[PDB]
């Protein structure tokens, strides 16, 4: 699976803080990718890999 | 990009606390300034690399 976020909230809370991130909130869902490749994911400044 | 904040407060937030930040607030935004210089930011006491 790849990254999934039906909002763009989720993928900022979840760029913003990775370990405490909502995988699941009220009608938006989010997927952590999950690969054989892992890639350093950044937005402006903040990093998560 | 540069620096840009719509309000101050954000700015003020995001020279307060580097990670935990939200880029985007109700009808305000704020950008991070990527740039291959990398100045450091001296808003009062606090410092940000």
């Not at 976020?5 to 993928?11: E, K, P």
């Not at 760029?15 to 699941?24: C, E």
């Given at each position: 699976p790849a990254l999934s976020?039906?909002?763009?909230?989720?993928?900022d809370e979840f760029?913003?803080?990775?370990?405490?991130?909502?995988?699941?909130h009220y009608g938006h869902y989010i997927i952590?990718?999950?690969?054989?490749?892992?890639?350093?994911?950044?937005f402006g400044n903040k990093v998560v890999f």
């Open positions: 976020a039906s909002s763009r909230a989720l993928i760029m913003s803080v990775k370990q405490t991130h909502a995988p699941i952590e990718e999950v690969a054989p490749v892992r890639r350093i994911l950044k």
